[PDB]
Design a protein around this ligand. Structure first.
Ligand SMILES: CC(C)CCC[C@@H](C)[C@H]1CC[C@H]2[C@@H]3CC=C4C[C@@H](O)CC[C@]4(C)[C@H]3CC[C@]12C
Ligand SMILES: CC(C)CCC[C@@H](C)[C@H]1CC[C@H]2[C@@H]3CC=C4C[C@@H](O)CC[C@]4(C)[C@H]3CC[C@]12C
Ligand SMILES: CC(C)CCC[C@@H](C)[C@H]1CC[C@H]2[C@@H]3CC=C4C[C@@H](O)CC[C@]4(C)[C@H]3CC[C@]12C
Ligand SMILES: Nc1nc(NCCc2ccc(O)cc2)nc2nc(-c3ccco3)nn12
Ligand SMILES: CCCCCCCCC/C=C/CCCCCC(=O)OC[C@@H](O)CO
Ligand SMILES: CCCCCCCCC/C=C/CCCCCC(=O)OC[C@@H](O)CO
Ligand SMILES: CCCCCCCCC/C=C/CCCCCC(=O)OC[C@@H](O)CO
Ligand SMILES: CCCCCCCCC/C=C/CCCCCC(=O)OC[C@H](O)CO
Ligand SMILES: CCCCCCCCC/C=C\CCCCCC(=O)OC[C@@H](O)CO
Ligand SMILES: CCCCCCCCC/C=C\CCCCCC(=O)OC[C@@H](O)CO
Ligand SMILES: CCCCCCCCC/C=C\CCCCCC(=O)OC[C@@H](O)CO
Ligand SMILES: CCCCCCCCC/C=C\CCCCCC(=O)OC[C@@H](O)CO
Ligand SMILES: CCCCCCCCC/C=C\CCCCCC(=O)OC[C@@H](O)CO
Ligand code: NA
Length: 390
């Protein structure tokens, strides 16, 4: 078998290339938010926390991955920290992603209460607590859920380790039942299934609210034709009461409230001539609603449609970032399951283990590109930053 150093050199060179890109791209995300007040909403504070975690992957997690790949002699508990510190950063990324899903769900479901409920100070508090839980969760093995009490005395005497030390290797010190049940199933897979369900409810809601609009818009228009072609005062009365209720459930910013007070006011005039029995004077009064609909109502339809379509396109960009996290991290998780559940399977080869590790660390590079390709405000700020400074 070849000198371990040769394949070892490839792995290191690759891991360092990844760390450079992780730092640069996510530093540029942070610079952008710092610089552009349009980017300084509550959602993007979570985006920033996510970015700071991806920077820390290049600054610390990747240097740790290189170290533990050597099996150098180390005191067990210090070896656990080198091995698990990435689990803290990964857990903080999940919390951050989960908070974004909820933040956007609160914006689609209750737009009118969003600003008083999701504030910057509350977000700061959430981010501060999620980082505290991430250290707790990601370093649980250090509290005694570890194989430190079972040292591999073959490996440790070969390496020449001393009194208290172990050959520092991930699968030798981190119990695989912590990795599968606690880290994967509970702390990664369940949160990602939640985010899946949140983003589903976001899209149903926007799809619901949209059809409610288009369905309110035809209620307004259809009932016009009823009036136009009626012959007794009563058909008009029945047709008008439907628009009125439709015009207020749509109503459910002083130009918008003047437009609908022109509209309902007209409806309430045609409803009075109808109730009085004047049939033609009610059809002609109800024809004055065309002027209001062309001047005011169509314009709330098109504007209410844009904001909903813009929320959908925005939640789709954020759903992609949750997909890439999963795409990138599931291989390393799925191999742990095989190692743990299939004792009669051969262990996955070394080359695949470090290919799945390298894959997991590339997730720290992709988010900056997603923002740039999918978010105008981020792309335009990236260009200003680059164009000017470099
Ligand atoms: C503030 C940031 C940037 C720097 C953090 C310092 C890091 C690199 C320090 C903090 C604790 C340190 C570890 C603590 C204990 C041990 C056990 C010893 O037998 C080998 C070294 C080892 C494994 C250390 C490696 C370096 C280490 C991980
Ligand atoms: C993107 C995510 C969701 C999909 C990743 C699935 C990958 C990691 C799967 C697909 C096929 C799998 C392999 C299939 C069979 C074996 C042989 C066994 O003796 C060791 C594990 C090993 C080598 C598996 C490891 C995990 C594996 C490589
Ligand atoms: C699709 C993703 C997002 C969720 C499901 C991922 C995990 C939990 C699933 C996907 C495929 C599964 C593996 C498929 C095959 C086997 C071989 C068997 O002898 C032991 C269990 C084991 C190793 C399974 C463990 C759980 C597993 C790794
Ligand atoms: N199973 C595993 N191994 C390693 N590194 C050890 C690679 C190895 C594997 C086998 C061997 O004989 C010698 C070394 N890092 C690992 N990281 C993870 C992981 C991190 C987050 C989720 O899973 N799993 N994981
Ligand atoms: C060492 C590992 C990395 C440490 C973290 C680095 C990033 C810190 C966050 C920066 C915050 C920021 O960019 O400005 C705040 C503002 O943009 C958002 O409110
Ligand atoms: C945040 C600002 C920038 C921080 C930059 C430095 C961060 C630390 C990066 C490196 C960490 C790797 C730790 C290596 C430990 C190696 C070690 O113990 O070597 C000696 C070993 O032989 C003990 O037997
Ligand atoms: C779209 C999903 C694709 C997965 C994500 C990217 C790649 C992740 C890492 C691994 C993927 C598949 C690896 C297949 C080959 C594994 C292999 O060589 O098995 C060796 C086997 O003989 C061990 O006994
Ligand atoms: C998923 C988003 C877009 C990025 C795609 C993933 C790219 C990551 C794949 C990287 C491949 C190079 C792998 C590392 C080189 C070292 C290696 O494979 O094995 C090193 C060993 O010691 C060999 O036994
Ligand atoms: C190893 C540590 C990782 C690197 C640090 C990553 C943080 C990225 C910093 C980018 C933006 C947030 C900090 C704002 C700094 C403001 C500054 O430098 O000048 C002040 C001026 O721009 C204010 O008008
Ligand atoms: C022993 C290794 C070093 C230990 C100390 C490293 C501390 C953890 C490293 C990673 C991330 C630090 C957390 C920073 C979060 C900053 C953040 O996003 O704040 C700004 C955000 O709230 C927007 O307003
Ligand atoms: C700009 C952010 C700062 C990045 C971190 C600066 C310091 C670390 C630089 C990069 C990689 C560390 C590589 C060495 C890790 C392993 C090591 O030193 O020894 C392991 C083993 O051979 C000991 O016997
Ligand atoms: C998806 C939400 C539920 C929790 C997270 C995912 C876990 C369930 C999905 C698939 C598989 C995990 C359950 C164990 C399957 C393997 C098993 O039976 O082990 C075989 C046994 O003979 C080994 O001792
Ligand atoms: C969006 C990402 C999610 C995509 C789906 C992820 C889950 C896919 C799981 C991948 C493979 C499971 C099937 C492989 C079975 C291997 C097997 O039976 O090996 C036989 C054993 O004797 C090897 O020695
Ligand atoms: Na991450």
């Amino acid at each position: 078998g070849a000198p371990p150093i040769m394949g070892s050199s490839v792995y290191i060179t690759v891991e360092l290339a990844i760390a450079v890109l992780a730092i640069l791209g996510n530093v540029l995300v942070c610079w952008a938010v710092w610089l552009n007040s349009n980017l300084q909403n509550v959602t993007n504070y979570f985006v920033v926390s996510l970015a700071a975690a991806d920077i820390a992957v290049g600054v610390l997690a990747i240097p740790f991955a290189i170290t533990i790949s050597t099996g150098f002699c180390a005191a067990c508990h210090g070896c656990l920290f080198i091995a698990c510190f990435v689990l803290v950063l990964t857990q903080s990324s999940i919390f951050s992603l989960l908070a974004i899903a909820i933040d956007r769900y609160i914006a689609i479901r209750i737009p009118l209460r969003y600003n008083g409920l999701v504030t910057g100070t509350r977000a700061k508090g959430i981010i501060a607590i999620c980082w505290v839980l991430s250290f707790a969760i990601g370093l649980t093995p250090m509290l005694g859920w570890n194989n430190c009490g079972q040292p591999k005395e073959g490996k440790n005497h070969s390496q020449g380790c001393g009194e208290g030390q172990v050959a520092c290797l991930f699968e030798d010190v981190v119990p695989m039942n912590y990795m599968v049940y606690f880290n994967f199933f509970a702390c990664v897979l369940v949160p990602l299934l939640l985010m899946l369900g949140v983003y589903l409810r976001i899209f149903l809601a926007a799809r619901r609210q949209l059809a409610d609009l288009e369905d309110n818009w035809e209620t307004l228009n259809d009932n016009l034709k009823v009036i136009e072609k009626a012959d007794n005062a009563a058909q008009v009365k029945d047709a008008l009461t439907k628009m009125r209720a439709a015009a207020l459930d749509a109503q459910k910013m002083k130009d918008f409230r003047h437009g609908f007070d022109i509209l309902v006011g007209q409806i309430d005039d045609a409803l009075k001539l109808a109730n009085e029995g004047k049939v033609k004077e009610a059809q002609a009064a109800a024809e004055q609603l065309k002027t209001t609909r062309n001047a005011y109502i169509q314009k709330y339809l098109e504007r209410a449609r844009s904001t909903l379509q813009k929320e959908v396109h925005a939640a789709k960009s954020l759903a992609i970032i949750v997909g890439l996290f999963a795409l990138c991290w599931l291989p390393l998780h799925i191999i742990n399951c095989f190692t743990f559940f299939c004792p009669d399977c051969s262990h996955a080869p070394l080359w695949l283990m470090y290919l799945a590790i390298v894959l997991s660390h590339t997730n720290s590079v992709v988010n900056p590109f997603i923002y740039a390709y999918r978010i105008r405000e981020f792309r335009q700020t990236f260009r200003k930053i680059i164009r000017s400074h470099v």
